[PDB]
């Protein structure tokens, strides 16, 4: 029995985390952020898709979990059971307070913790999907379906990078061949030219 999200959808109060001052906070509804086939190498999931936020507002953990569930369900139905990867890139740290009534009035009117919401900025990613290059329209449709579970405006944008990395897809193969990139599971490691050359010869031998 929680209030409608319109009561808590605006970034009105200062950031207020669960710390040694704020205690008794109930845990968030979203407890899993990564799912799909997350044991996959960076080589085989080149395509990336984002859910870019368009407003400065607050998102609830319940909404985040609902959107996660919707996206996973559609991706399982469409792209197979383990042909994708979903990463929710928002963690609810801001805790909201409710002043529960019933007749004290506004005397001593400081609320108790109710739940946790995530404060989001303009152009901040909400969700990311990593999958094969062929599944572009499936990713777009999954994000479109997940959009309806969030208040406000969001937009789907296909990233220029390679997978869940910060390096461009066009030059990714060039750089990994030229040995500046060492794949290390989900991501990749960038090798500078400034260490001891013992590491350089170890890589080159």
């Amino acid at each position: 029995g929680r209030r409608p999200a319109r009561c808590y959808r605006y970034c009105k109060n200062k950031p207020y985390p669960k710390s040694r001052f704020c205690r008794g906070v109930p845990d968030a509804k979203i407890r899993i952020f990564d799912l799909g086939r997350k044991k996959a190498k960076v080589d085989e999931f080149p395509l990336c898709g984002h859910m870019v936020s368009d407003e400065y507002e607050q998102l609830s953990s319940e909404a985040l979990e609902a959107a996660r569930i919707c996206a996973n369900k559609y991706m399982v139905k469409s792209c197979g059971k383990d042909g994708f990867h979903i990463r929710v890139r928002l963690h609810p740290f801001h805790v909201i307070r409710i002043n529960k009534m019933l007749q004290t009035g506004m005397r001593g009117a400081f609320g108790k913790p109710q739940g946790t919401v995530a404060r989001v900025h303009i152009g901040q990613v909400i969700m990311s999907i990593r999958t094969k290059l062929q599944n572009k329209e499936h990713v777009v449709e999954a994000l479109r379906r997940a959009k309806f579970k969030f208040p406000g405006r969001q937009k789907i944008h296909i990233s220029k990078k390679w997978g869940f990395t910060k390096f461009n897809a066009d030059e990714f193969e060039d750089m990994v061949a030229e040995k500046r990139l060492i794949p290390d599971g989900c991501g990749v490691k960038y090798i500078p030219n400034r260490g001891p050359l013992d590491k350089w010869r170890a890589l080159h031998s």
Binding site: V52, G123, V125, H157
Partner: protein, 159 residues
Amino acid sequence: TNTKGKRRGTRYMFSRPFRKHGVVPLATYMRIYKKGDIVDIKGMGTVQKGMPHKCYHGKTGRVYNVTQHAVGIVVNKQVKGKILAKRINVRIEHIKHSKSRDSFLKRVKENDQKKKEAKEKGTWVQLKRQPAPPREAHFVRTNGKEPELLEPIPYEFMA
């Protein structure tokens, strides 16, 4: 209402800079302060004796009494609608000299030098400082290569 503590709100004001804790350098103690000098007040948290009140931190005063370990300095303090010039005692650690007066001393020495010069010679010399004058007329040489054309780039959503 806040408290009336003597060190309330000095958490960062009296804290030492990063990687500069420990023993105080000796040159600060070894500076000499005559009476009538101009002094910048800045509290140092390493020493708890003769610490100035937090209202004087960042202010500039004038020495009037030199003592064994401290100096008496006259500072201006604004309270409500009036300004009071009141006297405090501050230890040598919380004290630095001010270069603002040294600049003017250098300028006045040069001014007297430049007055005693170019006076037996009969020529006139400017002494006052004038504000930044408007730029005079000048030419700009485009020797060969022409100014390149700049146009706004098309928009794309990078992120």
